[PDB]
Design an enzyme around this catalytic site. Structure first.
Site, PDB file in Angstrom:
ATOM      1  N   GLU A   4      67.618  89.381  48.136  1.00 42.96           N
ATOM      2  CA  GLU A   4      67.271  88.545  46.994  1.00 42.96           C
ATOM      3  C   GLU A   4      67.784  87.125  47.197  1.00 42.96           C
ATOM      4  O   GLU A   4      68.629  86.890  48.068  1.00 42.96           O
ATOM      5  CB  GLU A   4      67.830  89.121  45.691  1.00 42.96           C
ATOM      6  CG  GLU A   4      69.329  89.302  45.779  1.00 42.96           C
ATOM      7  CD  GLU A   4      69.917  89.536  44.396  1.00 42.96           C
ATOM      8  OE1 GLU A   4      70.551  90.559  44.055  1.00 42.96           O
ATOM      9  OE2 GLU A   4      69.751  88.537  43.606  1.00 42.96           O
ATOM     10  N   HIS A  62      65.687  88.801  35.386  1.00 38.21           N
ATOM     11  CA  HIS A  62      66.786  89.609  35.882  1.00 38.21           C
ATOM     12  C   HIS A  62      66.416  90.991  36.356  1.00 38.21           C
ATOM     13  O   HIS A  62      67.067  91.960  35.929  1.00 38.21           O
ATOM     14  CB  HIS A  62      67.853  89.837  34.733  1.00 38.21           C
ATOM     15  CG  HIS A  62      68.926  88.786  34.969  1.00 38.21           C
ATOM     16  ND1 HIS A  62      69.059  87.644  34.192  1.00 38.21           N
ATOM     17  CD2 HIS A  62      69.831  88.769  36.001  1.00 38.21           C
ATOM     18  CE1 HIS A  62      70.042  86.978  34.754  1.00 38.21           C
ATOM     19  NE2 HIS A  62      70.546  87.609  35.832  1.00 38.21           N
TER      20      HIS A  62
END
EC number: 3.1.27.-
Length: 108
Positions: free
Chosen positions: A71, A100
Site C-alpha cells: 500500500e 480506509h
C-alpha cells in the site's frame, strides 16, 4: 512529488517501484515520526508513507498463491494521514481506496 492516484499508478507500471517521495512506516518511525502528533512533515519533509505490506486480512482484494499486496498513501501533504491509499500487487494489479480500506475499486 508524485502522490496522486494516476501519478503513482502510472509510475508503478513504468518502473515497478514507488516514486522517491515514499518511505516505509518503520523508516518514518526511525526519523522521529509519532502518529499521534501528525508530525511526518516535520521529520521527513516532502515524504509520504508508502511500500508496506497489506496483509489483506479480509480477503477483499483478489488473492493468489505468491501474490503480495503493498500500500501507499495518496494526496498527503502534511499533518495527520488521510484515508486515501493505493494497493498494488506483485503482479501489478492496481486498486484504490478512499475510505480506509473499507472498499476497493480497480484503477489499473
Amino acid at each position: 512529488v508524485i502522490n496522486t492516484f494516476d501519478g503513482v499508478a502510472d509510475y508503478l507500471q513504468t518502473y515497478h517501484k514507488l516514486p522517491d517521495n515514499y518511505i516505509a512506516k518503520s523508516e518514518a518511525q526511525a526519523l522521529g515520526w509519532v502518529a499521534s502528533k501528525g508530525n511526518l512533515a516535520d521529520v521527513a519533509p516532502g515524504k509520504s508513507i508508502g511500500g508496506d505490506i497489506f496483509s489483506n486480512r479480509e480477503g477483499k482484494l483478489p488473492g493468489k498463491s505468491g501474490r503480495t499486496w503493498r500500500e501507499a498513501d495518496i494526496n498527503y501533504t502534511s499533518g495527520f494521514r488521510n484515508s486515501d491509499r493505493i494497493l498494488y500487487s506483485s503482479d501489478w494489479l492496481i486498486y484504490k481506496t478512499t475510505d480506509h480500506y473499507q472498499t476497493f475499486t480497480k484503477i489499473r
